[PDB]
């Protein structure tokens, strides 16, 4: 029916998506060789959203891997569920950006994104009625930020009346891998404010604290973080793949959650998330799900909403549940903590239910809250960017490649008006 | 422009259709009026046949 193509950029995007296709294929019962082995008819009836039957029970994922280094692509086909992707979908450069956003947006982008667009165009016309596009990338890298950024701009110029998601991890001062993170973040977000339909703000700090306290893991490699992110992404699209009492497509959530067109950066959470010592001691009820859902520490972004107010919030529930519990729980969590919600919008929480849980659990949830606390992140990177730019450090790879001085001044100005308009609407 | 020309032309064609439907109502009821009114003419016709009949009787 409605179809979503998948686009993974850079190293972070590629590895996030690899675990994503593994988890999804397990939900629909496709083995790593790409054949159907499920039992229920509910699994076979909605695999056209993410796959195409090739020949004789061969279901291939509708995904496009794109980056600038061969190591990532080889690491995809090596691991399991690596043999399911069509090899033509590996659009692929060779030289590399080197964490230089200009090289990802002006130097190397000019020779790859045309090739990327051919594969993307083929995957859009391969399906009938597009629901939207799904892009997983970072904001601190070069080949994920710049490459994915220019791709997003060109795509919105081609298919403008279609939805678009960008799952993006953002950098933070405590988890600081690259040195030019602020230059990449502020310019990348400057493009996201005018191109993306809605963006989902992620960051690595929150992922580390989820695996520290909630999951109580000892050695949380990147496989577990990608495992966490994949559960959230599968949750946002369960409504398209399984029937339920209250369905909510991507368009339904965006039109309902975004009160003003430029304010489309979200904070995400997921429930339930429990450690192996406490997976036995818990119950599975809607209120138990709700408090662990709205918890401050359980946000999958390191921006505490309790420093500000909620504008809108959304809940996507999965499993056999009673809709009265759904509605009364949203009403109670809004009445006790009444100051944390915006005032000139009553009933700031939209909720929906789907009748199919993730495999291995009786009942789960997914939270999408559009709060006003997100301006902290924009200031936290803006001051670092201004601190660097007022002495032109690290600028010659930017100005020597094609940027001028006015682009950084444009970035600050757009940065400053967005944090100012967040401040007004709060 | 063409997408809106089409809407104005559709409006014009419907304005004619509801007119055509109303015209059939006028056609039908007017036919009914002829049947009732010609019955009235026959009644007056019957009245005068009986009328000039009794006049001649009185004359003789």
């Amino acid at each position: 029916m409605r179809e979503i193509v998948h686009i993974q950029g850079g190293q972070c995007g590629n590895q996030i998506g690899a675990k994503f296709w593994e988890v999804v294929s397990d939900e629909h019962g496709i083995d790593p060789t790409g054949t159907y082995h499920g039992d229920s008819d509910l699994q076979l009836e909605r695999i056209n959203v993410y796959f195409n039957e090739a020949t004789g029970g061969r279901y291939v994922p509708r995904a496009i891997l794109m980056d600038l280094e061969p190591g990532t692509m080889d690491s995809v086909r090596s691991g399991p569920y690596g043999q399911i992707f069509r090899p033509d979908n590996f659009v692929f450069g060779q030289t590399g950006a080197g964490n230089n956003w200009a090289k990802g947006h002006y130097t190397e982008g000019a020779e790859l994104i045309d090739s990327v667009l051919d594969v993307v165009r083929k995957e859009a016309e391969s399906c009938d009625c597009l629901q939207g596009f799904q892009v997983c990338h970072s904001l601190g890298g070069g080949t994920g930020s710049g490459m994915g950024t220019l791709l997003i701009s060109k795509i919105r110029e081609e298919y403008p009346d279609r939805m678009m998601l960008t799952f993006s991890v953002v950098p933070s001062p405590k988890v600081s891998d690259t040195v030019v993170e602020p230059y990449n973040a502020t310019l990348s977000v400057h493009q996201l404010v005018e191109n993306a339909d809605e963006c989902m703000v992620l960051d690595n700090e929150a992922l580390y604290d989820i695996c520290f306290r909630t999951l109580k893991l000892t050695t949380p490699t990147f496989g577990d973080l990608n495992h966490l992110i994949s559960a959230v992404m599968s949750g946002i699209t369960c409504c398209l793949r399984f029937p339920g009492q209250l369905n909510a497509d991507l368009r339904k959530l965006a039109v309902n959650l975004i009160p003003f067109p430029r304010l489309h950066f979200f904070m995400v959470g997921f429930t339930p998330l429990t450690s192996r010592g406490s997976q036995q001691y818990r119950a599975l009820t809607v209120p138990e799900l709700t408090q662990q859902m709205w918890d401050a520490k359980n946000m999958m972004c390191a921006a505490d909403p309790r420093h500000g107010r909620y504008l809108t919030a959304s809940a996507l529930f999965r499993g056999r549940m009673s809709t009265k519990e759904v509605d009364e729980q949203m009403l109670n969590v809004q009445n006790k903590n009444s100051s944390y919600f915006v005032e000139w919008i009553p009933n700031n929480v939209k909720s929906s239910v789907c009748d199919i849980p993730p495999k291995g659990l009786k009942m789960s949830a997914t939270f999408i809250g559009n709060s006003t606390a997100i301006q902290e992140m924009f200031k936290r990177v803006s001051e670092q960017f201004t601190a660097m730019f007022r002495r032109k450090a690290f600028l010659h790879w930017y100005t020597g490649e094609g940027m001028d001085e006015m682009e950084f001044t444009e970035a600050e100005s757009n940065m400053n008006d967005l944090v100012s308009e967040y401040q007004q609407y709060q | 422009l063409y997408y809106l020309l089409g809407e104005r032309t559709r409006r014009e064609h419907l304005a004619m259709d509801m007119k055509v439907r109303a015209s059939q109502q006028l056609k039908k009821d007017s036919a009914d009026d002829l049947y009732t009114l010609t019955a009235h003419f026959n009644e007056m016709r019957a009245a005068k046949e009986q009328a000039e009949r009794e006049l001649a009787r009185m004359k003789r």
Binding site: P261, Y425 | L1, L4, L5, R8
Partner: protein, 170 residues
């Protein structure tokens, strides 16, 4: 604003009837696509491959093919009161040019009379349809009026409200 329009119609009707006959070249009541090219040549403008077919197509809407004087008044009136109609105006312009012509090369200051009749508008709005200035006159022809009117109508038509909307501030 009605008085300008009613008075204008009262006088232009007689001009219009002769404008019609003059556009016809076969001494009949029907205006063929063939005649339109001859008229443009008189104006000194050239049609494109398919322009004439569109010109004949859009105006006529009670029958198909050649046009008739009855269609022509219907067009005239609808277009004249068309203002917020977003309606076609391909063949209105050529006839209005011919009627508003009395010099047999075009008209200069009479654009303002055309403009005021349509709306009082503004001197800046005049600087939109063309570049005429109050003190200076110009030479004009058929070429520079139809093209500019056609482009203006395309320019207004494009603008619509998607994310161009602007709400009062908080």
């Amino acid at each position: 604003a009605a008085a300008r329009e009613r008075y204008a119609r009262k006088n232009e009707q007689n001009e219009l009837e002769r404008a019609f006959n003059t556009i016809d070249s076969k001494g009949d009541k029907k205006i063929d696509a063939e005649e339109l090219t001859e008229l443009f040549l008189r104006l000194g403008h050239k049609p494109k491959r398919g322009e004439v077919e569109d010109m004949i197509w859009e105006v006529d809407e009670d029958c198909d093919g050649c046009i008739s004087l009855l269609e022509f008044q219907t067009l005239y009136t609808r277009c004249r009161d068309d203002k917020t109609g977003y309606e076609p105006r391909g063949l209105f312009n050529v006839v209005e040019f011919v009627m508003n012509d009395k010099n047999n090369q075009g008209f200069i200051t009479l654009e303002e009379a055309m403009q005021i009749m349509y709306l009082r508008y503004g001197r800046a709005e005049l600087d939109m349809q063309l570049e005429q200035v109050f003190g200076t006159a110009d030479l004009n022809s058929g070429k520079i009026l139809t093209l500019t009117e056609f482009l203006h109508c395309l320019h207004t038509n494009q603008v619509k409200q998607l994310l161009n909307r602007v709400t009062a501030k908080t």
